[PDB]
Design a protein around this ligand. Structure first.
Ligand SMILES: Cc1cc2nc3c(=O)[nH]c(=O)nc-3n(C[C@H](O)[C@H](O)[C@H](O)COP(=O)(O)O)c2cc1C
Length: 147
């Protein structure tokens, strides 16, 4: 009944993606809360939520880095209340890079170590998200059925 959507986005790709997802969940009857990573703090962030969706863009010149706003959260993921919590991940990227949506893997690896429960494989979007719109909607739909 309650979902938290936390996103880290620079050029607004991931932000558009997060809000598409939320419409999908709010439509199915969930109570939704969307938050910019810049605005939140890690201590008990997952408290009171049945499902969490975390999205981030991928950066870095010579190594894989997470979006700036997300870093603090990622760093203190141990304090969010992730053990046994149902999560799913997403992000925007560019397949011209070697590690296509490398942030997604990093987060997912981190969550499993914490004992989170990963409901579905992460959504990884190439180029412009409005052109992968049906894919976003498809995923939200799948996420829903995997609960
Ligand atoms: C210097 C740089 C490095 C990037 N590195 C990667 C990468 O390793 N893997 C990937 O999929 N995308 C990579 N991308 C691209 C972004 O993630 C992409 O432009 C994305 O749509 C931005 O998402 P946002 O608006 O949510 O910030 C990089 C972009 C730049 C400028």
């Amino acid at each position: 009944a309650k979902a938290l959507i936390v996103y880290g986005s620079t050029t607004g790709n991931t932000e558009y993606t997060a809000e598409t997802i939320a419409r999908e969940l709010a439509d199915a009857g969930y109570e939704v809360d969307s938050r910019d990573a810049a605005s939140v703090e890690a201590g008990g962030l997952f408290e009171g939520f049945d499902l969490v969706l975390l999205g981030c863009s991928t950066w870095g010149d010579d190594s894989i880095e997470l979006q700036d706003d997300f870093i603090p959260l990622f760093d203190s993921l141990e304090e969010t209340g992730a053990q046994g919590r149902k999560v799913a991940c997403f992000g925007c990227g560019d397949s011209s890079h070697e590690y296509f949506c490398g942030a997604v893997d990093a987060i997912e690896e981190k969550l499993k170590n914490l004992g989170a429960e990963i409901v579905q494989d992460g959504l990884r979007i190439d180029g412009d998200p409005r052109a992968a719109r049906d894919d976003i909607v498809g995923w939200a739909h799948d996420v829903r059925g995997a609960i």
